Scaffold this motif. Structure first.
Motif, short mmCIF file in Angstrom:
data_model
loop_
_atom_site.label_atom_id
_atom_site.label_comp_id
_atom_site.label_asym_id
_atom_site.label_seq_id
_atom_site.Cartn_x
_atom_site.Cartn_y
_atom_site.Cartn_z
N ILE A 67 27.03 13.50 46.94
CA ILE A 67 27.36 14.27 45.76
C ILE A 67 27.31 13.34 44.56
O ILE A 67 27.48 12.12 44.70
N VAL A 68 27.06 13.90 43.39
CA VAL A 68 27.18 13.16 42.15
C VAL A 68 28.34 13.78 41.39
O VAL A 68 28.28 14.95 40.99
N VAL A 69 29.40 13.01 41.22
CA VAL A 69 30.57 13.46 40.47
C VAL A 69 30.21 13.34 38.99
O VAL A 69 30.05 12.23 38.47
N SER A 70 30.06 14.48 38.32
CA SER A 70 29.38 14.51 37.05
C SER A 70 29.76 15.78 36.30
O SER A 70 29.82 16.86 36.89
N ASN A 71 30.03 15.65 35.00
CA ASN A 71 30.11 16.82 34.13
C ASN A 71 28.86 16.95 33.27
O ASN A 71 28.92 17.45 32.15
N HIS A 72 27.72 16.49 33.80
CA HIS A 72 26.41 16.66 33.17
C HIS A 72 26.33 15.90 31.85
O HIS A 72 25.70 16.35 30.90
N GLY A 73 26.96 14.72 31.80
CA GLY A 73 27.03 13.99 30.54
C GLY A 73 27.71 14.76 29.43
O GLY A 73 27.39 14.56 28.26
N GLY A 74 28.64 15.64 29.78
CA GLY A 74 29.30 16.48 28.79
C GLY A 74 28.42 17.56 28.20
O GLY A 74 28.67 17.99 27.07
N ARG A 75 27.40 18.01 28.94
CA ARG A 75 26.43 18.96 28.41
C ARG A 75 26.58 20.36 28.97
O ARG A 75 25.93 21.29 28.47
N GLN A 76 27.41 20.56 30.00
CA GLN A 76 27.63 21.90 30.52
C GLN A 76 28.95 22.45 29.98
O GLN A 76 29.02 22.84 28.81
#
Ligand SMILES: Cc1cc2c(cc1C)N(C[C@H](O)[C@H](O)[C@H](O)COP(=O)(O)O)C1=NC(=O)NC(=O)[C@]1(O)N2
Ligand SMILES: Cc1cc2c(cc1C)N(C[C@H](O)[C@H](O)[C@H](O)COP(=O)(O)O)C1=NC(=O)NC(=O)[C@]1(O)N2
Ligand SMILES: Cc1cc2c(cc1C)N(C[C@H](O)[C@H](O)[C@H](O)COP(=O)(O)O)C1=NC(=O)NC(=O)[C@]1(O)N2
Ligand SMILES: Cc1cc2c(cc1C)N(C[C@H](O)[C@H](O)[C@H](O)COP(=O)(O)O)C1=NC(=O)NC(=O)[C@]1(O)N2
Lengths: 314, 314, 314, 314
Positions: C206-215
């Motif tokens: 998994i990639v723990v990510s908030n989409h670089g703050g883009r979603q």
């Protein structure tokens, strides 16, 4: 608030003497930041038929949970000096603390009437200090406010020290306590065990205070220690607090944290420098209205109810 | 957002009346800072075939977890005043709270249709207040929003109070509750035990609110008390929240903290001052889209799923 | 660092497309603030005879605990586009994630060699998406990076989408997993139970990510959820993280919090806009040196030792 | 304080060499922010008849809980260089740490007298390093300050390295310890278990230090780890701390957190660049007065009492 703007305009380095703290002034700013992060949880829908800001303290009624803090040389700020402040305090029903370094003799201040307290600095001759206590008690002063947090001043003039130093210890405290029937109030208590020991030593009250940030730079703000100290004392003595009280909401915050009353120092001097006695009475009137308003909005009919308010830190 | 820029341009001290808080406005800013430090933990990979922002509240469907907050004298912002806002709210499927101090009579607002709520200020004659409740219920209003956090206004005009004060107590609440079959909603609850007592007193809902920071300065923000209050109420009544809701992400944050719905006040007035009814409908359309987007990105097909989202404080 | 200054100079709104986040961009800034408040507790006096930054991930060695994040339309930043980045990544020994919206076909990127990963966006026709997976696997791609946090884009062009949308669900994940022997990596996991379910669903990472703050604006930063997610997964899959990785110290912080590797997005594009393939190889060389330096100063001979470092929040 | 203003005026990039940290300098700033959020809880009313700032450390009395930190190439700041600083330190009764990269030979510094410590950098030839230890011990140095946090320098000249590198391991530590009867002091310990192991390895002291923020960027400040390390060591060795000590209140904060003494680096160089030996003696005099004042205001007659003060984080 706007009062300090008037005090700044009217001289200039006397201002810095009044406004300043010791060292980096980290404890001076911290008194304010500590108050600003306290939030009150108000109560709603309670009967407010007779909201009263009065308290009983040292067997005597006061109009507000507030007294004027001891500030030295009040003729530095206005020719009437301490007599002006003491008169306005008397008219407002709030106690006035006579300073050991007052620019008017303590007997003259006490003659104004009202509720004079006397702040004692320990002098290196014990019996000079105890004489000062006797003069205060003879003059009708109602409490000895023993300033303990000044073994020496924390790191000019004029005009006079009209009442005329060593570190005060617990032995000095017992000497005062044995020498007077007045309640002894230790000003500058910050450690929980110092508060407990103060009760054991027979003090009638303590003032949780870092001297407005003027003694130890980096000392914890009194408001940060207030709730812990109130719990530890468990009603054994009155617990006052000072440092950065600038509004009725601040008084409410202090009482919600458990204080019996607050001391107000610098603002009372601003009101003295700008408009003398009438200016002090103005400040006390404004503070009295703000305290009453804050208490009602918080659902508190009495200061005792305000002491039972919960708070949250932000 | 950009709407407030348009409201500022178009007069000038009416703006400050709309935007301002009491005292130092510490509770006004704190409403926003409280929302900004809440972070949502979104859920992924859930079916979103039919994302719906609709809620049921007081037995009636609403298009959004949102209602228009009671704001007085809406002709201060636009000649159409409350009629414009009520029409746009009706068209958007969101309830509209009629204010006791509305510049258009409540019967006229209720005639617009939709889902009118009536906000009650307690008047010092009990039967005047209860008459206002009867008029609202006769006029088809769906809920009595009893404003409790105003025993008096926390520390100009024009144009009129077209519907024509004392502290409201729990007795006043019971008098209203006995006088109406409509759900009674207490607006301005901040203490956990006031929320519990509100359910015991028979309230159908509460609004966790510090009055947009306009009553007690230094009162805790409602969003900071929301989660605790939701747990204590345990579904016993609807729990709404307001103060600083400025986006669909803010609505999502509020619902993730447990709110049934939010109230929106100042932004709806900005949309009224700039472009009247069409401007309000524009704001409601934008908010509806942001709520829908935020919910989908968070993996929530329904507002109920959004209430089960976890949050983290930053 | 200084690279972004070069990327800004060279057009102008393409920059804002690359640098921007959704909504108030609160999650974009929070990725950085989250990293800045993590402090590493270095270990001293350990043998560093052979400090190695290499990791094994998906059965293949990588030169660094890092891969190039999927970024769409890389010819927006340089005429060579993805081919330049993929070549530099191959030369540096770091995996390169081919984007579904790549301005060069995926088979051409995979032909560059190295360690190509393929990022899949779910298309509303299931078998179009599964065809994309087959093309990637046929082309020698080593992992399917299933982007899950985009049911739709969170709230221009040119030049092309050379490989040629619906919400992805757990059913879509199982369809991919059944259709490929490649490890499936879910990108955009933030909830602890989504991470656990990802392992149950058979994901290899998994990639723990908030989409670089883009979603979702207001979504918790991935770095804030990383440690909790690593504990919950308990080695069940690889756990990557991205968002705001700007240095080797940031890579060290991520690995100390438990990440297997990081993704780097925007900086790789700055290096592409400024000096093309040579600029990317430059960035990868600088990052490789900083990671090696940070690991040695922290007393870590291997990335695995770096994962056992403790941290403190400031 | 004002001293650094004088050091800045008098060349210019030598300043940046003295003042700078590694990477983003996040650990350099954090040393100061960590100290600024520590608050001391002073004690009142204790006997201060004989406030003494003296400590015993490594069997020898020091006038202050302070030593001069090892700083290389002190002729970069003043022609007298290390000889000036060592003379003022001797006159002030504080130990002086001779740096391995001193611009004057260590035997000359030790000849100044006083309490010279020798800071050892591990050289890649073991017996060169052990020879340096022998020279220091032969020259009358009282402690070996083994700098451990420099396996290599964390990411110009002239004038000389008058005493004439590899990573130091626990084996290097044992080699030094076996080669000298002097106490071995490990400088740059940040992990609690490294502190415990240091005692097990026979160290006489440790310096809790992130090298003034000059090694690992993002390393936790030493002051943030001090209290934990003091508890874990349980008196097993002396625990010193450095980084951002800029006043006597800072010394008091460090001792209240449990430190035996502090090191002072950059300020001593400012005093050397501005007014040479007399300037250093001036700084040491000012620091000695501030420490004495802070201790008295805090109610501490001795440094040991200061170590028993409680603190609160703000
Ligand atoms: C100028 C001056 C003089 C004194 C004090 C404070 C100021 C600013 N103070 C502190 C004062 O009593 C309150 O502790 C503080 O003012 C509350 O903070 P605040 O100003 O934000 O309301 C004193 N305290 C003593 O006990 N004896 C004194 O001689 C005294 O040093 N003279
Ligand atoms: C100008 C004005 C007038 C009112 C209120 C707020 C503003 C700004 N409010 C507060 C409002 O109802 C929301 O609590 C708040 O606006 C939410 O915060 P928000 O603006 O950030 O969305 C009122 N509340 C009542 O109950 N009765 C009233 O007469 C009322 O005083 N008139
Ligand atoms: C311009 C652009 C385009 C994409 C992404 C990010 C930027 C800035 N991203 C986010 C990227 O993969 C990292 O999550 C992020 O860049 C890490 O943060 P960072 O830049 O601080 O290192 C994408 N992710 C996908 O999964 N699919 C895509 O099409 C993608 O939307 N295109
Ligand atoms: C210019 C310079 C040179 C050195 C050091 C620090 C500065 C600023 N330091 C750090 C110093 O010893 C204190 O740790 C630090 O200065 C405390 O922080 P402070 O300046 O806020 O008081 C060294 N340490 C070693 O062990 N060996 C060295 O060669 C040394 O690298 N030379």
């Amino acid at each position: 608030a706007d009062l300090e703007r008037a005090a700044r305009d009217v001289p200039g380095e006397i201002f810095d003497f009044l406004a300043g703290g010791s060292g980096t002034e980290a404890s001076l700013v911290a008194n304010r930041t500590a108050l600003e992060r306290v939030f009150v949880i108000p109560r709603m829908l309670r009967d407010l038929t007779d909201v009263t800001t009065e308290i009983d303290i040292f067997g005597r009624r006061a109009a507000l949970p507030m007294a004027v803090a001891p500030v030295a040389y009040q003729r530095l700020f206005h020719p009437e000096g301490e007599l002006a402040v003491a008169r306005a305090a008397r008219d407002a029903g709030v106690p006035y603390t006579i300073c050991t370094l007052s620019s008017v003799s303590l007997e003259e201040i006490a003659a104004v009437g009202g509720r004079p307290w006397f702040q004692l600095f320990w002098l290196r001759d014990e019996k000079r200090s105890l004489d000062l206590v006797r003069r205060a008690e003879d003059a009708g002063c109602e409490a000895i406010v023993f300033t303990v947090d000044v073994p020496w001043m924390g790191r000019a003039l004029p005009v006079t020290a009209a009442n005329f130093f060593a570190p005060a210890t617990w032995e000095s405290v017992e000497a005062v306590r044995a020498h007077t029937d007045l309640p002894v109030v230790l000003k500058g208590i910050l450690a929980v065990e110092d508060a407990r020991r103060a009760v054991d030593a027979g003090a009638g009250g303590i003032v949780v205070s870092n001297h407005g940030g003027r003694q130890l730079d980096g000392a914890v703000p009194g408001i940060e220690m207030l709730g812990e100290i109130v719990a530890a004392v468990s009603g054994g003595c009155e617990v006052l607090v000072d440092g950065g009280i600038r509004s009725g909401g601040d008084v409410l915050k202090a009482t919600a944290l458990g204080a019996s009353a607050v001391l107000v120092g610098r603002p009372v001097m601003w009101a003295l420098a700008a408009a003398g006695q009438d200016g002090v009475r103005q400040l006390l009137e404004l503070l009295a209205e703000e305290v009453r308003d804050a208490m009602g909005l918080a659902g508190c009919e009495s200061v005792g109810a305000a002491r039972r308010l919960n708070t949250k830190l932000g």
